[PDB]
Amino acid sequence: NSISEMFGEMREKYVGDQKFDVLDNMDWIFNELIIVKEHIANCCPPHWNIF
Amino acid sequence: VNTTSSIYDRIYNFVALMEHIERLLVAELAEDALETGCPHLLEIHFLLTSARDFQEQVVVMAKEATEDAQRTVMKLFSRLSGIISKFDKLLDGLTYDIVEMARAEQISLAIRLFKIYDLEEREDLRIEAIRNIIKKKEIEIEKSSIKKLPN
Amino acid sequence: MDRFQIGDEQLLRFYQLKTINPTHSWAQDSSK
């Protein structure tokens, strides 16, 4: 969740690459955080990024 | 049952050599091939190989001057390729498992096996160190009802 | 060894909620 919240926080590119496109790639990593989250709860119930 | 010698010699020695082999085989990577390939086989093979080396990681903290001096010294060089070549092999396979689970699919069998190792040894580690913190809380329940009786 | 009977399946079977990688036998993580 800090690989999607360090990939997400890493996808800021703090400029913001037009002026505020940090949440474009960051929220894209939030969509990948929902997909990796629900995919990993489909994978692992006890731990490893349930939700 | 107080005669576990030869199992500790062939399993501390085989824990040295075979987890030196499992410093690459159970520490499998490059790149995924289903995340190790198969980190429920691979990274959790380094978990149980680190649970057999939890005799040298967690039951090194249980065998604290039990009967001899080389049970954790001559087996410590058998735990250099034994413990941190299995626990960090499960952490190269675990940081590369969740990092492999940070790989956009990631995947329907890569995060399945890899996350299955990272829930098996994760929650097993949680009840394990919860059994050691409940060995200081079952000892705080027990030995602090004996040493801290107060009598 | 360093399997370690069985890190391939049965020690990944401490949770093993992943059908089907399969890579781990059976079955669950909690039974309380």
The DSSP line for A6-48 is THHHHT--SS-TTTT-HHHHHHHHHHHHHHHHHHHHHH-SSSS
Experimental technique: cryo-EM
Please state, in angstroms and rounded to a whole number, the distance separating the CA atoms of residues B86 and B52. Answer: 9
Q: Find how far residue B43's CA is from the centre of its chain.
A: 10
Here the tokens at position B115 are 């996350």
Contact C29 B46 (CB under 8 A): no
Closest CA to B77 of B22, B11, B12, B9: B12
Please state, in angstroms and rounded to a whole number, the distance separating the CA atoms of residues B36 and B34. Answer: 6
- Put simply, whether A46 touches B (Cβ < 8 Å) is yes
Q: Are B28 and B42 in contact (CB under 8 A)?
A: yes
Contact C2 B115 (CB under 8 A): no
What sign has the CA pseudo-torsion B49, B54, B56, B57?
Answer: positive
Contacts of A40 in chain B (CB under 8 A): 101, 111, 115
Here the tokens at position B57 are 């990681």
Q: Searching chain B, which residue's CA lies closest to the CA of residue C19? A: B112
Contacts of A43 in chain B (CB under 8 A): 101, 111-112, 114-116, 119
Contact C15 A46 (CB under 8 A): yes
Here the tokens at position B96 are 């590369």
Contact A49 B115 (CB under 8 A): yes
Resolution of the structure, angstroms: 4.4
Residue B125: Cβ within 10 Å count: 19
Here the tokens at position C23 are 């890579």
Here the tokens at position B68 are 């001899």
Pick left, alpha or beta for residue B135 (phi over 0 → left; psi -120 to 50 → alpha; otherwise beta). alpha
- Put simply, whether B107 touches C (Cβ < 8 Å) is no
What sign has the CA pseudo-torsion B33, B34, B36, B37?
Answer: negative
Here the tokens at position A22 are 């940090």
Alpha carbon of C14: minimum distance to chain A alpha carbons (Å): 9
Contact B120 C14 (CB under 8 A): yes
Please state, in angstroms and rounded to a whole number, the distance separating the CA atoms of residues B114 and B102. Answer: 11
